[PDB]
Amino acid sequence: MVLAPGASIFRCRQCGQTISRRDWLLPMGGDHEHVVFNPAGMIFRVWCFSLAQGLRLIGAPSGEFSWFKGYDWTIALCGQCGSHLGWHYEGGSQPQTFFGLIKDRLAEGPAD
């Protein structure tokens, strides 16, 4: 669609690991962005993606405190540097799985 796009790929902000792409943004409940808080009171602006790479999913899934009805989550770390980038969601419906990534922990930039 455009030549030399600068808003193509999302990398880990801390190390540059390739994580996702703007093309893979997923409008869960009508919006790719969901503003949420955890039990420790931390607020996250979470962007939902159909796909991601370069992460390491830690532990078994849990349904507790899930921000997305019908989904269980696993912590998603940057597979390169260990930065906590978000969560992988599974066990739900349409889609069965997706990633919720913390927007401000990613850097956006040109394709590879």
Ligand X SMILES: O=C1CC[C@H](N2C(=O)c3ccccc3C2=O)C(=O)N1
Can you give the binding site for ligand X, defined by CB under 6 A? 38-40, 64-67, 73, 87
31 is in an annotated binding site: yes
- Helix locations, the chain, DSSP H: none
Sheet bearing 9-12, strands edge to edge: 18-21, 9-12, 106-109
Query: From CA 50, how far away is CA 90, in angstroms rounded?
Result: 11
Residue 78: contacted member of Zn ion, ligand X, none (CB under 5 to 8 Å, by partner type): Zn ion
Stretch that binds Zn ion, among 11-19, 40-48, 58-66, 92-100 (CB under 5 A): 11-19
* Cβ-based neighbours of 111, under 8 Å, separated by 6 or more: 5, 8, 9
66 DSSP 8-state letter:
-
**Between 53 and 62, CB nearer to ligand X:** 62
**Between 23 and 38, CB nearer to ligand X:** 38
The reply on whether position 83 binds Zn ion by CB under 5 A is yes
Binding-site residues for Zn(2+) sit at 12, 15, 78, 81
